Ligand binder design. Structure first.
Ligand code: TPP
Ligand code: TPP
Ligand code: TPP
Ligand code: CA
Ligand code: CA
Ligand code: CA
Ligand code: CA
Ligand code: CA
Ligand code: CA
Ligand code: MG
Lengths: 523, 523, 523
């Protein structure tokens, strides 16, 4: 069999049936005779291709396969890979290389020093030394992406390799099963459980890896047994806990001093599935106040190594969450009281306050809706106003790289056809991956995009305010008609200048049978 | 003085007065108190930022300064850097890094292993070890970008460095002058000149570095003295010779066998300012046929090293071109006869043949117009139908990375306010950097964008045809309304469905006082 | 023809006839059927292999070819490559890789991510994508190493490639000639010459690249014409000027303040072939005092970029030195007076003062002797006491990496059979590459090794003294019998405990017909 046939069989046998890409000439030999049981999802720019694959992978909880064009295609996708790295997204990125006969002369489209291009944003990067090695290299890519800590991998393949004969021994790769579903040994696990049972005032902090492992329900049980408040680690890329559960305490502020102050009084703080800690603003102070012991369970050695305080256990989040939830004793402490409902902000008949938008979305959206957030100055309000009861209900660019939510919303909707996806995106952020709209229109993926139009890079004007920075250029983005942009890409567009219109537009959008974009005029 | 003040003085003293960027929080400390004698050009996505800076640098023939946001901003610009590498574009790319106090914990927005991110697409990449080193590092960046062979450089700067005190000895950096304007020593130059004077049937092949050095006029003189035909090296990123000059022979096909066949009979082939050779399609054969001696003058050691045949001289193109043009004897051979005018293709009243579009542009555009090409399946026709008499009249993505022409056209227009820029872009290519349109509208840069709409990735369907590849998915891009996209970004839009409309639209576009986009329905 | 035959023909045609190496299994396929016109020089450890090749290349002024074993062999040679990088040594380092069929499974002896191993100490690093590409890759290696700025390159080759068929078009590589013998254009050169003719008190500073280019004589003429004092740039790896010439001023101290103080009063300082400046100790102060203008001529863009002051011209040192020496006017100023003879230090009948050793060597050694220095605490005395009239008379580890002089002395002696090589090495430094002695014995290369035995890492005890550092462990190296070590490797050994014995031992050593090691007891 050819390398082409062998490789598609490998993919199919490993559960991959979809290719997200933007084609090029070095990739034609791979894409020809495309298998009938496969599905190709085209996007117009590489950041969009990867963003869609990313949302698809995160929501489906399985690896996504991507095919890009040489160095330029790969380069266009590197901002998206920064987010994928931080979110532990299992992405298999393949790029076509020039024919081996012309790599040396560096003919046009040659990806020079290929493996180094995507570094340091990949777990593994490689270009095979011969055509017969391709299936084996593809196998390595699949497993490296899937093993904890999951992350993106890169494989460059010269286009002339596809038609060559594959090693007949490649059949051994087809059904390989690799597992990293491990947990702390019995003896040490018993010690940890005892420390938890003995704590007088424990607190639990959860990160994105909990939602990735679908360990949400196990963490709820753990929180209920320990009768402990639960916080979501700062700069949260996903939501790991039902936001209206009595133990829920909200999103932690992303500052050193703010967090230690928040945890003061808690003798034992158990952090699960999050780095310690994804701070953002520089808020100097103590990492932890005296009297607090921190224990971290992470699926990533890099996270365990860099934590500036506490103990750590490197293991599978799902396996650990399940073990802990079943072994801890039920505390006789009283279960925490639920946080009160957020207040209603005064809303006149003019432009909409973000709070109003979120309250309305919470009112009108189905209970199993999935939200994506790329409205940077309104994140805190969004977290307090949306009741997200189920796992996989929230996504936000893990590395803070804009251009994620719009395409990712399409990938998530593709992965969860029965849950309405609603992406809330700022007018500034909307531009980074605007062409992704075309993919939703073409495949009729019913994502709803809500553009928060305030005409400025709000979050930046805010930091520009703290630093007390003046005369900073480039903070405003006036003159963009989002309805026209949506029309350009074949997506139905609506406008909301006030509350009445907002409610009407949402009613229509929710009843639509295709993707819809709503431009909202915000304060 | 602070690092901030010292750095802006360094830039100003080295001739930089414009910053192309997309702001972020790590960059606010650098951008605050923005100098009044500077100019900030905002673009909505990083590929667009770099593309604009690239066009500006290439057209002005001086380095362009760029400021991006951390890893995500840098990553979004890597496809654009692939083109910049191939075009020897002097680009100074700076990105903001997290505060030194939080780099270790990898707070959000930390650019991890920063210097490795842009590799291998940069000449030099670096992150200073202390704040006082910043001005010196900036100096290194400026010079590394400007010395032959020119190319992009990268500098990552922690945001807390800007307000620190600079080394008082930094003043020594302000007026440093670095030169690489060198040419072959007298003795060896005399030998080369003798070889040229002795040739019986010489041919000259010119590359992009000739136009970059503005050595066009010197090459015309050289060609006239030697009475030799002149070809433009394959995959041409720029036009180095007047296309209607009697010696002009056109664009060389990008294949090994095709080129050796084309050069057969020429005893001495002098290649100036081009790699040997930027092949594209695999057209196996002899690199050179017996009887042909090839001599290459390149400004790049990497080019000299990888040439599979001939001798090479590594030197400044301008200095070499000038020396050769003045030292060679006037041959008694007859000057080559000009190529005949291309034929008029039959055009009915329906959709436009690309040939018709180019003939019409040639008819109506000013004689000093500048063209950008990102209509991949029509490159050969474009080269035969446009009379480009002046230097800096043509640009095409040097690494074949789409998303270059649209933003680059804006940068070129900014650099040459008195020459009408006309970008000819395919409907597929238009999407990669569509948001750049906003920048033209906002600063009122009068670029004319001609979108060749044929609804498909034409060049790919063509390769898919040669390889005799079937069942290749993702080759069509239907359902895009370019007039709506232009409206979305504030740019006047026109449509041309036939010749009559094409002529009318061009008349209007040429008389416009701002940017204009014309969607052309092509066959 | 096979890749094996084609490659040896390429090497032979490019002037390479010697292979320096330490064999391994991945290299057997390359070494088999070793050409009869070639010469293989075996060394017992890789640092020794590279050190010998380095000395050979530096002294012969042509590239040296090296063959090492996979990652371990390459790794053992990386300290030696650090020196080669700093000395601009043209070294072609090749390493054998596992068979392509087993690279993927990482069988024993696989060099993983090969090209990244030697970085950042190489100009170019690469592993071919196919066997037919090997000759072309070898060609690139040869030229990259030879073009200015010269430096080490690395090529990894899977062992199964050698027996495959080579591309018949590879014959084009055989006689390629690449030149970088360039100099500043006429107009700018005239400006520089005028600045030199107009200077009232010029000073000249020379670096290692002057000796590498054999531009010594041209610099003497330049100094005599300008009637200017000449200094050797700090941390000198080579000697670029006759040390007893009336203009000679000695080795510059390696400190910022010390150098500016030394140059004070000189209006124009011309630096040729040296970085600006290879400082060592931290001696904070002004880089240059007011009134001094510095102009640097360097063959390295990296040097021009990082200079913290002055203008720079990037060009070939030989071409530039020759041009300047012939164009400057003869100044009417009086020629500088020669420095007085160094004083005789008092020497009793006990252990030898380093000054005594150097005076005696100067007295007894032939006038065309070549010295290598790796006696770190005695460098200043050595420079003042040895009259070195000819080019290529001195070598010192360019990156300060010990283990250079002993093997390099063998390589230099091999390159210059008619000039007596005398390596002066400290007892600490002698151990790093002690096994190199075997190579001298086996091929009967008559190098004389003088071991300065003082039982301690003297230079370190000295820095430990300045820093006023106390309780520093590991500074003494007692209990080493160098005569026994020499005997172990087959080299004649002598001992000198006092002056009488020193003179006697030197008389014998100079008359020897093979390598000799003299252990000298120093204070
Ligand atoms: C790729 C990328 N480029 C630039 C930035 C810097 N940045 C962070 S927030 C922001 C503002 C986003 O504006 P918008 O989406 O309109 O939302 P707002 O702040 O107004 O809520 C910008 C440009 C970024 N994080 N990522
Ligand atoms: C960043 C990038 N992505 C993908 C490609 C692959 N590619 C080469 S030509 C091409 C078609 C461009 O289509 P279009 O601009 O409509 O012009 P046409 O071929 O129809 O003339 C594509 C997608 C590329 N070279 N660069
Ligand atoms: C590979 C390497 N290891 C360690 C050092 C650090 N070092 C610099 S000088 C020195 C002392 C050398 O001792 P010796 O050769 O006996 O000479 P002395 O200082 O006594 O004159 C040492 C160990 C070095 N420069 N290179
Ligand atoms: Ca409500
Ligand atoms: Ca906004
Ligand atoms: Ca005409
Ligand atoms: Ca098209
Ligand atoms: Ca004497
Ligand atoms: Ca010693
Ligand atoms: Mg990289």
């Amino acid at each position: 069999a050819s390398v082409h046939g062998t490789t598609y069989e490998l993919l199919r046998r490993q559960g991959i049936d979809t290719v997200f890409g933007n084609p090029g000439s070095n990739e034609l030999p791979f894409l020809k005779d495309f298998p009938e049981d496969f599905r190709y999802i085209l996007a117009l720019q590489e950041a969009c291709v990867v963003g869609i694959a990313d949302g698809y992978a995160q929501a489906s909880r399985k690896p996504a396969f991507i095919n890009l064009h040489s160095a330029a295609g790969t380069g266009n996708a590197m901002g998206a890979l920064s987010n994928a790295w931080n979110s532990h997204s299992p992405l298999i990125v393949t790029a076509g290389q020039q024919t081996r006969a012309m790599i040396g002369v560096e003919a046009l489209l040659t990806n020079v020093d290929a493996a180094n291009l995507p570094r340091p944003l990949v777990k593994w990067s490689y270009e095979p030394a011969s055509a017969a090695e391709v299936p084996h290299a593809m196998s390595r890519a699949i497993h490296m992406a899937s093993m904890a800590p999951q992350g993106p991998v890169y494989l460059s393949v010269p286009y002339d390799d596809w038609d060559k004969d594959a090693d007949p021994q490649s059949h051994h790769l087809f059904d390989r099963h690799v597992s990293s579903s491990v947990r702390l040994n019995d003896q040490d696990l018993d010690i940890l459980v005892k420390a938890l049972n003995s704590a007088s005032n424990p607190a639990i902090v959860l990160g994105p890896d909990v939602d990735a492992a679908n360990a949400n329900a196990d963490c709820v049980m753990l929180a209920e047994r320990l009768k402990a408040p639960v916080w979501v680690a700062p700069s949260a890329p996903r939501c790991p806990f039902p936001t209206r559960h009595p133990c829920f305490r909200g999103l932690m502020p992303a500052g050193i001093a703010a967090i230690s102050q928040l945890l003061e009084g808690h003798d034992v703080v158990l952090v699960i599935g999050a780095p310690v800690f994804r701070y953002h603003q520089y808020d100097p102070g103590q990492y932890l106040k005296p009297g607090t012991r921190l224990i971290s369970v992470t699926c990533d050695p890099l996270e365990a190594a860099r934590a500036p305080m506490g103990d750590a256990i490197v293991a599978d989040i799902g396996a650990m969450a399940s073990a802990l939830a079943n072994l801890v004793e039920e505390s006789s402490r009283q279960l925490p009281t639920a946080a009160p409902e957020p207040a209603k902000v005064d809303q006149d008949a003019g432009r909409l306050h973000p709070e109003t938008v979120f309250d309305t979305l919470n009112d009108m959206a189905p209970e199993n809706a999935i939200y994506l957030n790329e409205s940077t100055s309104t994140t805190a309000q969004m977290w307090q106003r949306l009741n997200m009861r189920n796992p996989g209900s929230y996504y936000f660019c893990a590395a803070g790289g804009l251009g994620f939510a719009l395409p990712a919303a399409i990938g998530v909707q593709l992965a969860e056809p029965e849950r309405q996806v609603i992406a809330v995106i700022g007018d500034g952020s909307a531009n980074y991956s605007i062409s992704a709209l075309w993919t939703a229109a073409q495949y009729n993926i019913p994502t709803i995009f809500v553009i928060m139009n305030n005409g400025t890079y709000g979050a930046l004007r805010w930091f520009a305010g703290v630093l007390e920075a003046e005369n900073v250029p480039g903070l405003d983005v006036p003159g963009i008609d989002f309805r026209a942009l949506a029309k350009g890409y074949g997506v139905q567009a609506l406008k909301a200048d006030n509350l009445e219109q907002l409610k009407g537009s949402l009613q229509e959008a929710l009843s639509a049978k295709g993707p819809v974009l709503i431009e909202v005029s915000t304060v």
